[PDB]
Amino acid sequence: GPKFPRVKNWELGSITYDTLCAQSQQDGPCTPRRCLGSLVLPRKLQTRPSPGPPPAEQLLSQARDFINQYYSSIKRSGSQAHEERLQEVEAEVASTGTYHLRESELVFGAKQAWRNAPRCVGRIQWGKLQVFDARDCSSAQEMFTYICNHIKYATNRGNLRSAITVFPQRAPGRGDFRIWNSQLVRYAGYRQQDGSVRGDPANVEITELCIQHGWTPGNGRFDVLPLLLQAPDEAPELFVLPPELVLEVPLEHPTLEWFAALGLRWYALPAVSNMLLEIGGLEFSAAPFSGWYMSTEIGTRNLCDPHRYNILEDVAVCMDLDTRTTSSLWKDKAAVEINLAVLHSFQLAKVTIVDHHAATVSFMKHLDNEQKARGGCPADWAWIVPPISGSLTPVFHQEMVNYILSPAFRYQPDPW
Amino acid sequence: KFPRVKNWELGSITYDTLCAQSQQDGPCTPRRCLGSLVLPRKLQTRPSPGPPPAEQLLSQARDFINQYYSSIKRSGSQAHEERLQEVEAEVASTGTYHLRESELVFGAKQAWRNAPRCVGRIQWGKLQVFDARDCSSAQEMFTYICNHIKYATNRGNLRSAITVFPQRAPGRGDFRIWNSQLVRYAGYRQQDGSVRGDPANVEITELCIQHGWTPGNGRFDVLPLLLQAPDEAPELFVLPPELVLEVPLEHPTLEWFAALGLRWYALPAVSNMLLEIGGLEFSAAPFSGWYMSTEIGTRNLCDPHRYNILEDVAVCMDLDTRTTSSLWKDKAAVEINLAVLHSFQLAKVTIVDHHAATVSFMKHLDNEQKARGGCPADWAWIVPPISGSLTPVFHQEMVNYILSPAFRYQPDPW
Ligand code: HEM
Ligand code: HEM
Numbered sequence A: 001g002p003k004f005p006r007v008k009n010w011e012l013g014s015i016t017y018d019t020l021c022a023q024s025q026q027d028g029p030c031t032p033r034r035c036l037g038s039l040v041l042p043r044k045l046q047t048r049p050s051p052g053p054p055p056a057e058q059l060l061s062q063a064r065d066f067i068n069q070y071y072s073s074i075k076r077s078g079s080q081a082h083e084e085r086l087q088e089v090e091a092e093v094a095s096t097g098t099y100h101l102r103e104s105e106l107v108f109g110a111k112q113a114w115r116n117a118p119r120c121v122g123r124i125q126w127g128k129l130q131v132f133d134a135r136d137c138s139s140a141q142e143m144f145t146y147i148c149n150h151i152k153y154a155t156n157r158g159n160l161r162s163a164i165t166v167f168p169q170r171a172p173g174r175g176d177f178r179i180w181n182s183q184l185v186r187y188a189g190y191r192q193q194d195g196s197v198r199g200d201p202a203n204v205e206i207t208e209l210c211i212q213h214g215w216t217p218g219n220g221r222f223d224v225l226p227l228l229l230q231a232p233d234e235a236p237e238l239f240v241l242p243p244e245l246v247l248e249v250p251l252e253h254p255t256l257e258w259f260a261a262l263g264l265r266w267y268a269l270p271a272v273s274n275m276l277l278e279i280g281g282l283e284f285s286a287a288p289f290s291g292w293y294m295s296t297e298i299g300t301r302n303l304c305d306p307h308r309y310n311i312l313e314d315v316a317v318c319m320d321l322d323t324r325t326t327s328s329l330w331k332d333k334a335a336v337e338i339n340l341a342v343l344h345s346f347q348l349a350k351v352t353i354v355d356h357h358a359a360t361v362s363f364m365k366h367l368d369n370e371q372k373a374r375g376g377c378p379a380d381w382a383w384i385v386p387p388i389s390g391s392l393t394p395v396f397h398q399e400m401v402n403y404i405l406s407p408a409f410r411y412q413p414d415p416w
Numbered sequence B: 001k002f003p004r005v006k007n008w009e010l011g012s013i014t015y016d017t018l019c020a021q022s023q024q025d026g027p028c029t030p031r032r033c034l035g036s037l038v039l040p041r042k043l044q045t046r047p048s049p050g051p052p053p054a055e056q057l058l059s060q061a062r063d064f065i066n067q068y069y070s071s072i073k074r075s076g077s078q079a080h081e082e083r084l085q086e087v088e089a090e091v092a093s094t095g096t097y098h099l100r101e102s103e104l105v106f107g108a109k110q111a112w113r114n115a116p117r118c119v120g121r122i123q124w125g126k127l128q129v130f131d132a133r134d135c136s137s138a139q140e141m142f143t144y145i146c147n148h149i150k151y152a153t154n155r156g157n158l159r160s161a162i163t164v165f166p167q168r169a170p171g172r173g174d175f176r177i178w179n180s181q182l183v184r185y186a187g188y189r190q191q192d193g194s195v196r197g198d199p200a201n202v203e204i205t206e207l208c209i210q211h212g213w214t215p216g217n218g219r220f221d222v223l224p225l226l227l228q229a230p231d232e233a234p235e236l237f238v239l240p241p242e243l244v245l246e247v248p249l250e251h252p253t254l255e256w257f258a259a260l261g262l263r264w265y266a267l268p269a270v271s272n273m274l275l276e277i278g279g280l281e282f283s284a285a286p287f288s289g290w291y292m293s294t295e296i297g298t299r300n301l302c303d304p305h306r307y308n309i310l311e312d313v314a315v316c317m318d319l320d321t322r323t324t325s326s327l328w329k330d331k332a333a334v335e336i337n338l339a340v341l342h343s344f345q346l347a348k349v350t351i352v353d354h355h356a357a358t359v360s361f362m363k364h365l366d367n368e369q370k371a372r373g374g375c376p377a378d379w380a381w382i383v384p385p386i387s388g389s390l391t392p393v394f395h396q397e398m399v400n401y402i403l404s405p406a407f408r409y410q411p412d413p414w
């Protein structure tokens, strides 16, 4: 039949063909010999620091592709403005070695980047992103202002709004704008004398870096870290976020009255800040983005992962379960109640959140829209299926095709 | 080339060098990954009307023979050299060859060992191999299949086993077991397109009826077997009820669960897969071990296109099925898996929960890293259908590739 991947949904028996993968211009990590789809950070997109200006030849073609996507999106492909814009980009890259995007071009690109992210299950919302243009930012202090505004607009007192703030792109042999923290909101991770960790083990390094840079550390389990912001060719500066701006949700359970005594909590805004946004060859090293949480991210991963808060055993003990044997399914029981507590608490505090059932269903709708709109949707099965109750959701039974499309969000090396 | 494999829970790192031994292509390319696809689009097992390319078959055979003698530490020995000559001789004169029983045993175990989607491979060295290559009729297949079932079941103390029927031959039909498993519950399509029983078995159920089976009307009616000898219509055989061990499902604390009348068989014996050893193909080679509780409790009983009992259990538990956020699906699913575990343990029938199973697979990964320098594994299948990140395999990166001997899918004989 069609010379494209045949995709099947085993629950409904329906079939589709992905023709969109034909548009991918960047190789992934797999080969006919072996599949490397499970690797978290395969040395592929990895935007390793490329100091010396990029080959005008490679950049120009990437730029040309992006401009074609843009004009196609506004239904003016082949027009006079399209050919003139193409000329303008080539000319600019010819004299300066690089080029700049127009406002509307940035907005379209940022949205496409989200839309193109294979691992994001919340892409049904891709068309609704508030793009803050911060390309005029010239200091670490101004970065903080832009970030504080982002948090305020995005948090919106609990009625969260997706947003992204874009700082200046990487320039020819010049220092990058960088946000050292992986997220705008992170709990400190304090290395203990016995080797253990108090707080979030995932943030041990960034916490120590904050201390090395003058931060006076606390000693709690949920201490909000300050931000280490870095302007070009300058050392990072430390900034403490005002408490009133960081909305947190104390966790309680709908029926287990003791759950609240656990003193657990999580912040409302998931704002990733260490990823690079690539559009038409241009690289925005600092471009924090945020949406809202899917409950399993908090209740299953951040709270139950063995290398994170690891509260599974504590909750099971409180539930008086037999943690001495696997077949009692104590981990499964506790995990469920913990996820329920998260959903319940966020709802109680009127903070936006979506459970894994609602989210995955909406993603199936997204796949249908995308099938019609672009002929497919790049998706990473291992990341789209939730960490708990996987086969209980519709996505588990849906085959997916994974590939890299640009604009895109990519991981990049740590600045230190 | 050689992929760096990391475990994100422990931070440990290994390098898979075993993948370099792969001689068969998967569905992925640098352009796009198709790891989530269940079946191959082309990596099928096309007809066998003509003799396979002598050159190709000879290379696959020499490699297998090589693997075998290395397994018995007699590589380069006189026996090794002479056996290779024997295989050379047969292929050149007949276009094919035959394996010795000891070779067949080694190959079967290796095929299981190499299966990327199998989480129970730590047991790979313990497999009872029945040589049924001297079978010339469906009736004889039935007798072999019955002995496999008696042996494997062992009155609840399940033992891993495989029975191997005659290999495929050029221009001749294949021996085939039409059922996908030796034990399957009927799926009857009724009135308004609904289904009484197992929806997964609707087609096989009707084929059985068309071939003379007098169908029942229950939710768990054990299907008869359709066995097919070369170029012959398949024959119908009813399995002796005393050979099919089943486990009534009840819950440890929820008294009403037993009233649901749910149940499942003890023996998971896949019979529609093809076993390939040294280029030779075994179209009928049913294999079995024991169930991992999630296969029954989660997939078989909770999949929307299967028994789909989630809502019923939820209502019995009087849960808020009005909204997703109440996590009623998650709560019901957990109790169902608990019921399956409770029941099998009560009935004294071998079963393994997903936590235990995954822990043992991690040990297997380590055993294989030292033994062969890697282990082909399919993340999507190794991770259980529920509580994924609560198991260690979720946090372990894996490299997937095809090694031979191997088990593979084949076209349905109709
Ligand atoms: C509207 C709410 C949203 C929800 C519910 C959502 C949820 C998720 C989830 C569950 C993941 C996987 C997390 C993990 O397993 O580590 C994810 C990944 C991702 N999301 Fe979304 N997302 C949303 C908004 C956004 C926004 C606003 C953007 C960007 C503009 C975005 C970009 C991404 C990217 C790039 C990844 C992949 C990260 C990686 O490579 O590990 N998401 N999202
Ligand atoms: C001893 C107990 C065993 C357990 C607990 C076990 C468990 C499993 C599970 C859970 C799967 C995944 C099925 C699914 O995703 O629905 C699987 C797949 C597989 N197992 Fe095992 N297994 C065991 C023994 C065996 C034996 C004896 C063989 C053969 C000699 C075998 C061959 C396979 C094969 C070929 C697959 C891959 C199926 C495919 O590619 O679709 N297993 N096993």
Ligand SMILES: N=C(NO)Nc1ccc(Cl)cc1
Pocket: A270, A271, A272, A290, A291, A292, A293, A294, A297
């Ligand atoms: N809900 C989320 N975002 O809005 N979660 C989320 C978590 C991590 C990354 Cl990298 C990207 C997204």
Ligand SMILES: N=C(NO)Nc1ccc(Cl)cc1
Pocket: A008, A010, A396, A397, A398, A399, A400, B036, B037, B038, B380, B381
């Ligand atoms: N993860 C699995 N385990 O059985 N299976 C599986 C089921 C459906 C699709 Cl689409 C992909 C994989």
Ligand SMILES: N=C(NO)Nc1ccc(Cl)cc1
Pocket: B268, B270, B288, B289, B290, B291, B292, B295
């Ligand atoms: N428990 C099992 N085997 O022993 N289950 C099982 C189910 C399907 C396939 Cl294909 C292979 C194995």
Ligand SMILES: N=C(NO)Nc1ccc(Cl)cc1
Pocket: A038, A039, A040, A382, A383, B006, B008, B394, B395, B396, B397, B398
């Ligand atoms: N499926 C995931 N979603 O977050 N993550 C994940 C974690 C570890 C490995 Cl090895 C592979 C994938």
Ligand SMILES: [Zn+2]
Pocket: A030, A031, A034, A035, A036, A037, B028, B029, B032, B033, B034, B035
């Ligand atoms: Zn792949």
